[PDB]
C-alpha cells in the first residue's frame, strides 16, 4: 500500500529551536544553562524510518492537515511497545501499545488497519485537546529519564521558502512518564480514500550545548547566545 516517495534537501536552521529549560520564573536576568539544544546555524534536512538520536526538532508550515501525529519506536514491531500520537479535529490519542505497524502506515480517512494490524498489551492511554491548532509550527521531542517531553510553538510567518530569522521560545506542552526506549520515528499522513498528495517538513537533531538566555521584565526569553559558535560568543559567555 506504498504511495509516498521522499526527496531529501538541505538548508540553514539559523537561530531557531529555543525552549524554556525549566518552569522557574525569571525577569531581567541573564541565565546560563547546559542542556540539549539545536545548535545555532545547524544544517537541517528538508523532506518532500528516521533515527531519533538524543532529540528531534520538527518544523512544518502546511495547512492541508496532511500532518497528524507521529510514531516512535525502536523496532516498529508488535514485539516492543511504541508511541502513537494521533491528532484529529476534536481530541488527541496517545498510546504505548505494541501495535503491529505496517511498512508505510497512513490514515485512510479513518480506519487504523492500514496504520497497524492489531492492538495488544499496554498500560498507558492519554486523551486531551489536540496538539495542532502563513503559519509555522515547531515541535521539540526528547525522551530522558523515564519521561517523554514535548514542547511546541506556533507563529505567523510571511510567505518565505526558508525558516525565518528571529527568536521564538517554545513553551512546554506535555511530559508523559512513559520510560521506554526510542530509536526511530515516522511521520503519519492522511490521504483520502488513494489520491496523490505532497507534504514537506524540516527535521533537525539536538546536541548538548551551553546557552546564555536573556529574560525581560515580563519573563519571556527574547535573546540567546550559543557559547561554542565562535570566539566572540565565547567571550560574551565568559563576560556574561
Amino acid at each position: 500500500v506504498n504511495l509516498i516517495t521522499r526527496t531529501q534537501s538541505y538548508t540553514n536552521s539559523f537561530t531557531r529551536g529555543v525552549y524554556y529549560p525549566d518552569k522557574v520564573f525569571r525577569s531581567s536576568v541573564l541565565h546560563s544553562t547546559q542542556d540539549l539544544f539545536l545548535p545555532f546555524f545547524s544544517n537541517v534536512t528538508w523532506f518532500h524510518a528516521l533515527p531519533f538520536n538524543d532529540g528531534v526538532y520538527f518544523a512544518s508550515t502546511e495547512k492541508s492537515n496532511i500532518i497528524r501525529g507521529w510514531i516512535f519506536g525502536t523496532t516498529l514491531d508488535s514485539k516492543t511497545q511504541s508511541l502513537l500520537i494521533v491528532n484529529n479535529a476534536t481530541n488527541v490519542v496517545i498510546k504505548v501499545c505494541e501495535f503491529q505497524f505496517c511498512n508505510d502506515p497512513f490514515l485512510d480517512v479513518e480506519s487504523e488497519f492500514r496504520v497497524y494490524s492489531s492492538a495488544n498489551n499496554c498500560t498507558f492511554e492519554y486523551v486531551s485537546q489536540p496538539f495542532l491548532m502563513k503559519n509555522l509550527r515547531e515541535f521539540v521531542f526528547k525522551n530522558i529519564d523515564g519521561y517523554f517531553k514535548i514542547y511546541s510553538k506556533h507563529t505567523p510567518i510571511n510567505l518565505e521558502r526558508d525558516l525565518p530569522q528571529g527568536f521564538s521560545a517554545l513553551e512546554p506542552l506535555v511530559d508523559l512518564p512513559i520510560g521506554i526506549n526510542i530509536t526511530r520515528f515516522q511521520t503519519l499522513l492522511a490521504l483520502h480514500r488513494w489520491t496523490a498528495g505532497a507534504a514537506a517538513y524540516y527535521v533537525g537533531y539536538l546536541q548538548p550545548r551551553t546557552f546564555l538566555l536573556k529574560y525581560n521584565e515580563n519573563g519571556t526569553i527574547t535573546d540567546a547566545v550559543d557559547c561554542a559558535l565562535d570566539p566572540l560568543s565565547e567571550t560574551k559567555c565568559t563576560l556574561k
Binding site: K23, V24, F25, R26, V29, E171, P172, P177, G219, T220
Partner: protein
C-alpha cells in the same frame, strides 16, 4: 569586664518571630493504590519483579502499619516517621517473594546472588524497604516450585535492570548447543517451600518503594490537612512541600500558565502561587537587625 568605658558597642542581634503557620496542599481526593500493591495473593518471582508507578493521588501510609507486624521496615533517604508530610513527584513499587535469610541482601552497596544477578539498587537510593513473613500463604505441604531465582550470569546487573532471558548457561569453552550436559547448567533455580522448614528458609514478601524528588510540580501529597491563608504578617508557610517563613503579600508578577516558582539574581525564592486558588504571592523576609548599646563610662 566589670567596667565599661564611654562609647558604643555591638552586643547582639534580633529577629522578628513568626506568628502562626499556613499550610496549603492540593485538592485531589483520590486514594493512592497502595492497597492493590499489597495483599495481592500473587507475587512474582525475584528474577521477574513487577514494577508499578503511583502518581496523582493522596498517599496514606496507615495501611502499611495496619497490614502486619512487619519483619523489616528500613528507610534510607528519609525518616519513616515523617513520610506523612513529605511531597513526592512519582512513586515506584517493586514487589516479590524471597528467602528469609537473603532479606539483608536488599540494600545499597550490598553484594550477593540476588544483589548481582536478580535485583540491584542504586547507591543514591532514596526510599524504603518492607519485608514481612508469608509462610502460611506461599508454602505448600509438598512444596511450592512456582518461585524461581536466577543463579548464573556473565556480568553484573545495573541498578533497576531486569533480565528475563532463559538460556542454558555455558561455564566453559565448549558451547552447550541447546542441551544441559556436563559443565552446562540452567540459569534458574526453583525455591522449595514447605511448612516444616525453619526460620531462614520460609518465604518472605518484600516491597521496595522508591521516591522521586526535585522534579516537575509534585502531585503525590495529600495526607496533611490544609489551612487558611493570611497576609501581611510574619508567618510560616508550606506550599506543596516548599517550607519557609516570611511575609506574604499580593504580587503584580505576570506568571505564564506553566511557572510555579520565582527566583532572582541571588537565586532565592521570591514568588509562589497557591495550589488551591491560582494567585501569585510575593514573599519577603521578616525584619532582622543588630542592637548597639550606647553608654558613658561606668564611673
Amino acid at each position: 569586664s566589670f567596667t565599661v568605658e564611654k562609647g558604643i558597642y555591638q552586643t547582639s542581634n534580633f529577629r522578628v518571630q513568626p506568628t502562626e503557620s499556613i499550610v496549603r496542599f492540593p485538592n485531589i481526593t483520590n486514594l493512592c493504590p497502595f492497597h492493590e500493591v499489597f495483599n495481592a495473593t500473587t507475587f512474582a518471582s525475584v528474577y521477574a519483579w513487577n514494577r508499578k508507578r503511583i502518581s496523582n493521588c493522596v498517599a496514606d501510609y496507615s495501611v502499611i502499619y495496619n497490614f502486619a507486624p512487619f519483619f523489616a521496615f528500613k528507610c534510607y533517604g528519609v525518616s519513616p516517621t515523617k513520610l506523612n508530610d513529605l511531597c513526592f513527584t512519582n512513586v515506584y513499587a517493586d514487589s516479590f517473594v524471597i528467602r528469609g535469610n537473603e532479606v539483608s541482601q536488599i540494600a545499597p552497596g550490598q553484594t550477593g546472588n540476588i544483589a548481582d544477578y536478580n535485583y540491584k539498587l542504586p547507591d543514591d537510593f532514596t526510599g524504603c524497604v518492607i519485608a514481612w513473613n508469608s509462610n502460611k500463604l506461599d508454602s505448600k505441604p509438598s512444596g511450592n516450585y512456582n518461585y524461581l531465582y536466577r543463579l548464573f550470569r556473565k556480568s553484573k546487573l545495573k541498578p533497576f535492570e531486569r533480565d528475563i532471558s532463559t538460556e542454558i548457561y555455558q561455564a566453559g569453552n565448549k558451547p552447550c548447543n541447546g542441551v544441559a550436559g556436563s559443565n552446562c547448567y540452567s540459569p534458574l533455580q526453583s525455591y522449595g517451600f514447605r511448612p516444616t522448614y525453619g526460620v531462614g528458609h520460609q518465604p518472605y514478601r518484600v516491597v521496595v518503594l522508591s521516591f522521586e524528588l526535585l522534579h516537575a510540580p509534585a502531585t503525590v501529597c495529600g495526607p496533611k490537612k490544609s489551612t487558611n491563608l493570611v497576609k501581611n504578617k510574619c508567618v510560616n508557610f508550606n506550599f506543596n512541600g516548599l517550607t519557609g517563613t516570611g511575609v506574604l503579600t499580593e504580587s503584580n508578577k505576570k506568571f505564564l500558565p506553566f511557572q510555579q516558582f520565582g527566583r532572582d539574581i541571588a537565586d532565592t525564592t521570591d514568588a509562589v502561587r497557591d495550589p488551591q486558588t491560582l494567585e501569585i504571592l510575593d514573599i519577603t523576609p521578616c525584619s532582622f537587625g543588630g542592637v548597639s548599646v550606647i553608654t558613658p563610662g561606668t564611673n
